[PDB]
C-alpha cells in the first residue's frame with residue numbers, strides 16, 4: 001500500500017532551509033500514529049534533516065550515493081525500488097519524491113497548515129477534481145499547538 005504523508009501550508013510550502021517552518025507537536029504525533037509499524041520512504045536531504053531513523057518503523061532512504069550505509073536505515077537508489085517494498089509504504093518527502101510520486105500513490109495523508117510561511121520547498125499543486133476527501137478533521141489548538149491545521153485523507157478518484 002502506497003500513500004503520501006505530508007504537511008504543507010496554504011501555499012504548499014513543506015520546507016525552509018532543510019527544516020519544517022512551523023512547530024506543531026500534534027502533527028508529528030499524527031505522523032507517528034500513521035507510520036509506526038510500517039515503512040517511511042524519504043529522500044536523502046529529508047533523512048539528513050531528521051538525522052536519525054524514526055523509532056519503531058522501517059526507514060528507507062532514496063539516495064544516489066552508493067557510499068550510503070546508515071544504521072537503522074535501508075537504502076534504495078531508484079524510485080522503482082519503492083514498488084518492491086512490502087506493507088503500507090508512506091512517501092515521506094521531500095519535494096523531489098512528492099513530485100515523483102504524486103501521480104503514483106493510492107492516497108495522501110495531508111496536514112494543511114492554515115498559515116503562510118516563508119519556504120524554499122513545495123508540495124506540487126493538485127486539484128480536488130482528482131482527489132476525494134475520505135476525511136477532514138480539524139486539529140486541536142492549545143498552548144503547544146498554536147497554528148490551525150487540518151488532517152486530510154484524500155483518495156484518488
Ligand SMILES: NC(=O)C1=CN([C@@H]2O[C@H](COP(=O)(O)OP(=O)(O)OC[C@H]3O[C@@H](n4cnc5c(N)ncnc54)[C@H](OP(=O)(O)O)[C@@H]3O)[C@@H](O)[C@H]2O)C=CC1
Nearest residue numbers: 006007014015018019043044045046063064093094095096
Ligand atoms: N513538511 C513535510 O511534510 C516534509 C518536509 N520536508 C522538507 O522538504 C525539504 C527537503 O526536500 P528536498 O530539498 O526536495 O529534498 P529530498 O528530501 O527530496 O531529498 C533530495 C535527495 O533525495 C535523493 N533522491 C531524490 N530522488 C531520487 C531518485 N529518483 N534517485 C536517487 N536519489 C533520489 C537525492 O539524494 P542524493 O543527492 O544523495 O542522490 C536528492 O538530492 C526539507 O526542507 C524538509 O524539511 C520533507 C519531508 C516532509
Ligand SMILES: Nc1nc(=O)c2c([nH]1)NCC(CNc1ccc(C(=O)N[C@@H](CCC(=O)O)C(=O)O)cc1)=N2
Nearest residue numbers: 005006007025027028029031032054055092093111
Ligand atoms: N504530515 C506530516 N507532518 C510533518 O511534520 C512531516 C511529514 N508529514 N513528513 C515528513 C517529515 C519529516 N520531518 C520529521 C521531523 C520529526 C519527526 C518526528 O520526530 N516524529 C516522531 C514523533 C515526535 C513527537 O512525538 O513529537 C515519530 O516518532 O515519528 C518526523 C518527521 N515531517
